[model samples]
Target: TAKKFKVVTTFTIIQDIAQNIAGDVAVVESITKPGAEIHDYQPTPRDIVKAQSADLILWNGMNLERWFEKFFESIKDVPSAVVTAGITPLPIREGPYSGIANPHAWMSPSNALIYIENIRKALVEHDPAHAETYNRNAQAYAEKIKALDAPLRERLSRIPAEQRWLVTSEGAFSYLAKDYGFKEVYLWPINAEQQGIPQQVRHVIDIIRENKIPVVFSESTISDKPAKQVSKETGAQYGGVLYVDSLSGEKGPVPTYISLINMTVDTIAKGF
Candidate 1:
């Protein structure tokens, strides 16, 4: 491992922003692996030791991590930064946890842009010698992200206004579905609630049938059992798993967040 300037990220979403801004100049590691559910995650000893020694720590800090207070305490002396500090946190959907804001804001591209800016600021502050490079790369990466907006919007808008309904395993997509005008449906209100509960399956199936939706999806972080059951009973096609909670392993489908976005949007387009 190059282990250049050690950078630590809490999960894959933050890891993606850091990778783009740091380029090949720094060695970045994420504590969470692909397809892992962040809310229920238990950190490994290896992850703790690595975080303690890292030069900089980056993560989303919207209270998404149920164990964040302790995790940060564990890495007490390490410099930590929240990538979502600059972005406006959206309100949580009405049903879950008595209106607690959904912590999965990174699913939206606009919020992700702000995340990169914050990450770049942290990296530059931590290592001033590379300030110019870090800022420049951050700007470059923003442009690349900006370029994808029109295409993603165009593709998503094709889902048709009336039929633009999205059903997932969790409510992590509330922001995306809200912004893009999709009726958000999920088997469980949050990952904390196990998917495939009878209430979960029946509620979503009713909507899918009413809307004539031919397909629905599973999630990389969740089990496929619910989606499979829905499809079997309702005759709706199982679209595919959406990679939101974590990322793909290095040799897998979407090793990085950018590829995650590209592959995910493309998959949705085809799923339709």
Candidate 2:
């Protein structure tokens, strides 16, 4: 009997991406529950024990998983890979964490190719029996990812350049904004901080009012209160939720990485 591979990912989004690349050849699951904040997640004893049986573990590095190393220490014998290794990281441009790597590289479709390749390499290296299947899936998925970039950008281009501002509660879209030509504005640099503080709210409020940006959005993993407040005070429409940091469960708007990015572009276009 062939031994089936068991894979563990740090979060739902990564889990989905790996599943697409992995197909049915391996069993994959995430340590973090759907919509949980990945940055500050605390693993339970159950999680550690479950991970003890993993054939391979996957996670987004660049400091996204804050407790991953300590958790990794316990399962040092398990094979694991940092999924976001090769891409150049963008630094947080505002708040206390300025100059630190932004950690959301997967938000950009082009960058995700790098991620997919890394996944393929890691899976093949760990389980040579499935090398052909893993490589083939990764190549097809990469092409699909490439296909999405053009039309998504075309849709985003519909919004006037001036109104192409991406306002949100956290500055999590640095990579997406940089690739998509939108100016990024957020209440805080990252979510692992004093999010939606009075100062943070007031700062973004000023940007909205001063620039008269039309619509704003927040991410799925965090409260939309701060963004809602900005909308009310500034008269900008509370656009909607953008998925990052995590993916929605099987029944939600963004159950896959492809749909997550597509839905975000659609939401932004509709908001404009």
Candidate 3:
């Protein structure tokens, strides 16, 4: 194999974005797999070994990776970048973690532009020889994300105002919901909080019944049973999984960041 700069990200979504920016100039790998629960994740010894050889590491900050602090300490000498840097974080509401920053900033196409720029800067800084390639790829990739904004907003706008509620298991869509004009309702503020508990379920059920929300959803990285339970109790339809926090494998529906956003918007619009 040719000797190329190696970049490690905390999870698969970031890995995909970094790969896009790096092009063939670098090798990007993720510590967490597709559909893995990222919050409160425990890294294995093998993960540590894999990260040790990286020229640079990138992870979403804003408390997204609870284990990242210790994981990075083990490989203290390696340079790292917080890919979510430079974006204003939305606060997580309605849970023990209330007032804390929401870690899923990449869900919003606008914030994703910031993430793409940060990834480009990190790759270029690490391998100046490939700066031109990284810059060109980053600009092109960003245009794709920018292109989705208006049309997605237009499609989502067609949903009646009264029915524009986005209910889900985790409140990970705050950023996206804000972007697409949705009022987000969730069972828990973040996945690390106790999930599917009686009180949590009861609250969402009340919201669904009160608002007559027709559809509900859960993230691909967590159990859908809770959302399903909410739907069953409230008579709302369970609108399949939404991709956030991670990207699926190459053959899956959301293999790339662009596909992830497109699929998510398509699913949500179709559900309505």
Candidate 4:
């Protein structure tokens, strides 16, 4: 017999959300692997071929994957969904980023729940016959994610208010900063430009100095070199990497996006 309907998603984080909605009823392929950085990822020829043959594609948009906008348009006939479509996202607060900023909606688990709803709707739109199952899976998944918010908040609040700043690779945590009541004192805006420059270093150092935020961080999306450099210069302690862009490797800190939030919150709370 033929395989189930083929659903393809662009990145692992989005892939995780899409797969929950697709459940056991469909086949899902994630173009980006765990720990893969999507910001500057150049898709292989196989990715384009997969897109060409896919029944549907799920992507995250905004200024993100800025290159994919035109590419997706060329393959517009396939049913494609932007899981972030309905989020009232934050405006680019820093960096060279423009318009609605920071496409890391899933960082804030609340938005991750919304992504599930949107993914469920996308599944229903493509395969109406499976609507009930999709809704069921989405409902179950939402509950698990919803259970996460309060714990995340409580953990984050433990870091003394003065030391609640997160200085990481990019300002990727803009939405998360706002959600968890931490400020993102970063050197770069979105990891796309001016990385490791004195300006980025100086900016983070300033925040560390002013806030006395002894604990700084890095994410799996980019190298920890800049973050480590900032830590060394400022005399601030650096923590383990956070999984912002994608899941960690099977043995890494945040192996799943769900665990990513919990582990990051716990790390921050404890590190402080």
Query: Which candidate gets the maximum lDDT versus the true structure?
Result: 3
Expressed as tens digits, the lDDT of each residue in 1-272 for candidate 1 is 25478799888878877988988788788888767778867887787898998998887877787766687787766898877886676665534563666788888878878888888889999988778878889999989887878888887767788987787777678767766787877777667743347876887888887788877888888888888888888878888788888888889998877777777777767788
Q: How much is the lDDT of residue 76 in candidate 2?
A: 55
Worst 10 residues of 3 by lDDT: 191-200
* Candidate 4 lDDT tens digits, 209-247: 767888778887788888888889887888847667787
Could you tell which candidate, 3 or 4, scores higher by lDDT?
Answer: 3
Candidate 4 lDDT score relative to the true structure: 0.77
| Residues 59-136, model 3: lDDT tens digits | 999989999998888996899999988999899877778899999999899898999999999888879999999999
Instruction: Give lDDT tens digits, candidate 2, residues 1-272.
Output: 26669999999888988998889899899999888999999999999977888999999999989999998888858988999979999998777777999999998899999999999999999989889999999999999999997899888877777777899877888898989889998888887756448887888888888779999999898999878988998889999798878888889788899998999889888888
Candidate 4 TM-score versus the reference: 0.92
lDDT ranking, best first: 3, 2, 1, 4
- In candidate 3 the C-alpha lDDT for residue 212 amounts to 91
Q: Which scores higher on TM-score, 1 or 3? A: 3
**Model 3, runs deviating above 4 Å:** 193-196
Better of 2 and 4 by lDDT: 2
Better of 1 and 4 by lDDT: 1
Clash totals, every prediction: 1, 0, 0, 1
Which parts of model 4 have CA positions greater than 4 angstroms off? 73-76, 98-100, 250-253
TM-scores vs. true structure, each candidate: 0.93, 0.97, 0.97, 0.92
lDDT values for all models: 0.80, 0.88, 0.89, 0.77
